[PDB]
């Protein structure tokens, strides 16, 4: 008017086809939006802070710490960013019996990032007047010959006698020491005499934090791996500066090696069959590693490191732009 | 939408306006074209970036979280652990989904408002030197060349400068 010049106010459209939901309206095509939800992983188990996990593989935590002969690959392991059991982690206690407070031991290990293994009661040195062979046993075989745990030492009679031992270790490692022993409960024994030379025997283990006596329960028990005897496994965490004392007249499966523990946050035990690879991640799940800065993920509730928050959602898209109306 | 502009009295968007979320189209003797409004786009980008950053800040990363084991005589505590893990997951899934829905509503309305307020700000500059011809457009009652168009876009339109020529045209009809 007169010449018809015009100005119009309007808003952007584009060819975006992403949609967001609102409360009033589902599937609204917007011009710009962001996805808040990570749903991708690389299908591998990776290092954190340059440290590889510990892959126990065919072994479980019990076979690892006790030193099952099938776990010899683990002997040199001293530090890890997390611990991995697989769906085939079955080599644990090769000589049958209960691992006492095992779920607690697993909870403790979950905050251990490394250790220093050492020979707590060196074999054939700390035991001048007891036998140190046989067992050994076929239940725990290696290369088709009876063998034993690499960390425990099965003590036996020195020909018909067995004097009340008293072996004591003082913790001068400057940290907690995890000490494992066993107590053997032979069947109709007989065997009791044949191994320990004394029939009314006992084991006693003492420190400030822990004190317990064990009487052998000699009895008829089903065969497990050709063995009708059973063996109970025990652990304790010896405090820095404190003293642990073993006393017995038989049936002691004694500590040979023990572990000096380094605590660390951010570590843990996971079950995964994914393969380990030389990759690095800040976030690890049992399905695989996440490389993401998104605030949520739907991959797995189990996480090592620093991860997005697990939610059940399959979609979380947040609008940034406006309703997209490229054509009328 | 709540403010009546987007998919409202301004029926559709413009794929031809590339530089921003809101802006202008003009036609005069020199030609036609689009131009984003920078100030309104900037303020919207400030709010939306802040909104997204606030969502991120409230939702903390999760650090190491692993399972626990229980023996065959610890079913009560095993189930309690389960109830805790499931319940917190229910609550965080609910919170995340709902915050997204609620904020998406508010985001589309904010854009709608912004368009409305830009329309009204231009209308209020032009007064009766232009007529409203629907769909977010104004027809000037005077010749408006590119310098004049730019004065509208930058908020310094000179009503008195064009008032007489406008009035003569407006009073002809």
């Amino acid at each position, epitope marked *: 008017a007169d010449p018809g010049d015009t100005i119009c106010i309007g808003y952007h459209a584009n060819n975006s086809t992403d949609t967001v939901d609102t409360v009033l309206e589902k599937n609204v095509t917007v011009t710009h939006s962001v996805n808040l939800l990570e749903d991708s992983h690389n299908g591998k188990l990776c290092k954190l802070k340059g440290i590889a996990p510990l892959q126990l593989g065919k072994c479980n935590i019990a076979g690892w710490l006790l030193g099952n002969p099938e776990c010899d690959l683990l002997l040199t392991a001293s530090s890890w960013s997390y611990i991995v059991e697989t769906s085939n982690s079955e080599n644990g206690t090769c000589y049958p019996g209960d691992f006492i407070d095992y779920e607690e031991l697993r909870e403790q290990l979950s905050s251990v990032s490394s250790f220093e293994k050492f020979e707590i009661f060196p074999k054939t040195s700390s035991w001048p007047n007891h036998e140190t062979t046989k067992g050994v046993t076929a239940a725990c075989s290696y290369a088709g010959a009876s063998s034993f745990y690499r960390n425990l030492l099965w003590l036996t009679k020195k020909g018909s006698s067995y004097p009340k031992l008293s072996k004591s270790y003082v913790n001068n490692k400057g940290k907690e020491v995890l000490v494992l022993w066993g107590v053997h409960h032979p069947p109709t024994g007989t065997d009791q005499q044949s191994l320990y030379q004394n029939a009314d025997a006992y084991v006693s283990v003492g420190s400030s934090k822990y004190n317990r006596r064990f009487t052998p329960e000699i009895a008829a028990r089903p065969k497990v791996r050709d063995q009708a005897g059973r063996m109970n496994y025990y652990w304790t965490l010896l405090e820095p500066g404190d003293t642990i004392t073993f006393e017995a007249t038989g049936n002691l499966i004694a500590p040979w090696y023990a572990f000096a523990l380094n605590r660390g946050s951010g570590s843990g035990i996971i079950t995964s069959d994914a393969p380990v690879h030389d990759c690095n991640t800040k976030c690890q799940t049992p399905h695989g590693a996440i490389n993401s*800065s998104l605030p949520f993920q739907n991959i797995h509730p189990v996480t090592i490191g620093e991860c997005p928050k697990y939610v059940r959602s399959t979609k979380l898209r947040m609008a*940034t*732009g406006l309703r997209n109306i490229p054509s009328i | 939408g709540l403010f009546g502009a987007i998919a409202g009295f301004i029926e559709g968007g413009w794929t031809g306006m590339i*530089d921003g979320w809101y802006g202008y189209h003009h036609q005069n003797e020199q030609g036609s074209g689009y131009a984003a409004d*920078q100030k309104s786009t*900037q303020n919207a*980008i*400030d709010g939306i970036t802040n909104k997204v*950053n606030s969502v*991120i800040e409230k939702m903390n990363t999760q650090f190491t979280a692993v399972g626990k084991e229980f023996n065959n005589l610890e079913r009560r505590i095993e189930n309690l652990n389960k109830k805790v893990d499931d319940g917190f997951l229910d609550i965080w899934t609910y919170n995340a989904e709902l915050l997204v829905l609620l904020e998406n509503e508010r985001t589309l309305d904010f854009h709608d408002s912004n368009v409305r307020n830009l329309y009204e700000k231009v209308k209020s500059q032009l007064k009766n030197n232009a007529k409203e011809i629907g769909n977010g457009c104004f027809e000037f009652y005077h010749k408006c060349d590119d310098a004049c168009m730019e004065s509208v876009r930058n908020g310094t339109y000179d009503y008195p400068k064009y008032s007489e020529e406008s009035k003569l045209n407006r009073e002809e009809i």
Partner: antibody, heavy 121, light 109 residues
Framework: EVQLVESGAEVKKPGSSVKVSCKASGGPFRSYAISWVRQAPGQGPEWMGGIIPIFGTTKYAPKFQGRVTITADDFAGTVYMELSSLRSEDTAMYYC??????????????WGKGTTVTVSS | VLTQPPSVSAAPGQKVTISCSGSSSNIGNDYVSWYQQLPGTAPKLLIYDNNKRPSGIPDRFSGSKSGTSATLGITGLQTGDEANYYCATWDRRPTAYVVFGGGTKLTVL
């Protein structure tokens, strides 16, 4: 104020590519654009290109168009510059720098400290 | 490109001006910014929008723009002002891009 931290020094062969990163503090989403500017010794700076927030639009200098790609990971608060088909005259200090608003322009108010790229056979 | 003198000098307290000459596609219809650069550091913004000062920059520095040319003025000259100075603007022409001047080295005697 914002701090802009760039990735470490790079040494590359002619014909290869280099990718440099710039992480902006705060955020992580940004209401302002960020450009890459380089400076060969002892020459003036040359604007390579920049990227607009939300829109993701890029603009490149004619001298680099066709072989520079600028990208953003907004949840990481990071922008990247990839320069391909490297030549020995791509030997320079590479700076990120932010603009005052969402649009790329001549005014860049905060700069990274720069990272060196050396291209040699 | 924009044309600057390669090198300007003065004495403490004295005043020097660095000029920036372009064309109608660049300085002619766009805002001019100025950058200072010391050895081993990133360009630092001194003036934007032809003559505005960011905070941190003192009224000793100022800038001007006239037609196709821009000017940086430095009064009260100091030792620490010894540096390279670059002008910058938007060139709408070939394809749009930010162009910088070739640089002026200020030496303080």
């Amino acid at each position: 104020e914002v701090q802009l931290v760039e990735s470490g020094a790079e040494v590359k062969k002619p014909g290869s590519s280099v990718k440099v990163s710039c992480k902006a503090s705060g955020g992580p989403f940004r209401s302002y654009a960020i450009s890459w500017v380089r400076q060969a010794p002892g020459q003036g700076p040359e604007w390579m290109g920049g990227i607009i927030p939300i829109f993701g639009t890029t603009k490149y200098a004619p001298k680099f168009q066709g072989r520079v790609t600028i990208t953003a990971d907004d949840f990481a608060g990071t922008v990247y510059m990839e320069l391909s088909s490297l030549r020995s005259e791509d030997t320079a200090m590479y700076y990120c720098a932010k603009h005052m608003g969402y649009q790329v322009r001549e005014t860049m108010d905060v700069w990274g400290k720069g990272t060196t790229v050396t291209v040699s056979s | 490109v924009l044309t600057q003198p390669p090198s300007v000098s003065a004495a403490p307290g004295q005043k020097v001006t660095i000029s920036c000459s372009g064309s109608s596609s660049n300085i002619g219809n766009d805002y001019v910014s100025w950058y200072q650069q010391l050895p081993g550091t990133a360009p630092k913004l001194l003036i934007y929008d032809n003559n505005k000062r960011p905070s941190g920059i003192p009224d000793r520095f100022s800038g001007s723009k006239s037609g196709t040319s821009a000017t940086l003025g430095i009064t009260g000259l100091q030792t620490g002002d010894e540096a390279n100075y670059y002008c910058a603007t938007w060139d709408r022409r070939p394809t749009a891009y930010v162009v910088f001047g070739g640089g002026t080295k200020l030496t303080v005697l």
